[PDB]
């Protein structure tokens, strides 16, 4: 059911998504071990993910959560990195593949820093890095991130020691 629509770099949506990617890079306390050493990206392509089934399931849940939280979905746009992005765009996020090792419970993780999500694109801790060169700092291989619409509703605030 999914179709991918290529956005022109001249498109305001391409430009605003790029700016959120670039502007949310930070340094990491691992010195670049997991995600590599960089201050910015080379954006190669931005595709809009169009799936009527997935969108309708999202908006149905968003209305349920809104109604449970004084008409407030608390909807954010957040990055997700994992080796499973090509699965997720076809079948949606699957909570049965939840991150059990995560600091905040067994669920689906998203990040405000694009560079946090970049740490996970080749797996937990960056895994063994890119498939071709086994390099977590590969400057050659193409990476993919999702920029996602996320309903937080009433969000439990867990202060992290990070």
């Amino acid at each position: 059911g999914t179709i991918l629509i290529d956005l022109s770099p001249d498109d305001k949506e391409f430009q605003s998504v790029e700016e959120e990617m670039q502007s949310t890079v930070r340094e990491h306390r691992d010195g670049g071990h997991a995600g590599g050493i960089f201050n910015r990206y080379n954006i190669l392509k931005i595709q809009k993910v169009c799936n009527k089934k997935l969108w309708e399931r999202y908006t149905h849940r968003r209305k349920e959560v809104s109604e449970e939280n004084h008409n407030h979905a608390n909807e954010r746009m957040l990055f997700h990195g994992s080796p499973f992005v090509n699965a997720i765009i076809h079948k949606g996020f699957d909570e049965r593949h939840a991150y059990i090792g995560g600091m905040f419970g067994a669920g689906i993780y998203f990040a405000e820093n694009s560079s946090k999500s970049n740490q996970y694109v080749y797996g937990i801790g960056g895994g063994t890095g890119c498939p071709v060169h086994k390099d977590r700092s590969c400057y050659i291989c193409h990476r993919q991130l999702l920029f996602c619409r996320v309903t937080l509703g009433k969000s439990f605030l867990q202060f992290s020691a990070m």
């Binding site: 960089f38 608390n74 689906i108 050659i140 992290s160 020691a161």
Partner: protein, 45 residues
């Protein structure tokens, strides 16, 4: 599962003052994978 009467968790760094939040949801229907971004990291000059 989310904490009772919560829909998500906000993992808010309290030590690194420049680190922004992480978020966890427990139902895949609470996210839509809206944009697929293909990129390289750039080697600093």
């Amino acid at each position: 599962h989310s904490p009772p009467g919560h829909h998500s968790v906000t993992g808010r760094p309290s030590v690194n003052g420049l680190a922004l939040a992480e978020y966890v949801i427990y139902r895949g229907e609470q996210a839509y994978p809206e944009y697929l971004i293909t990129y390289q990291i750039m080697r600093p000059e």
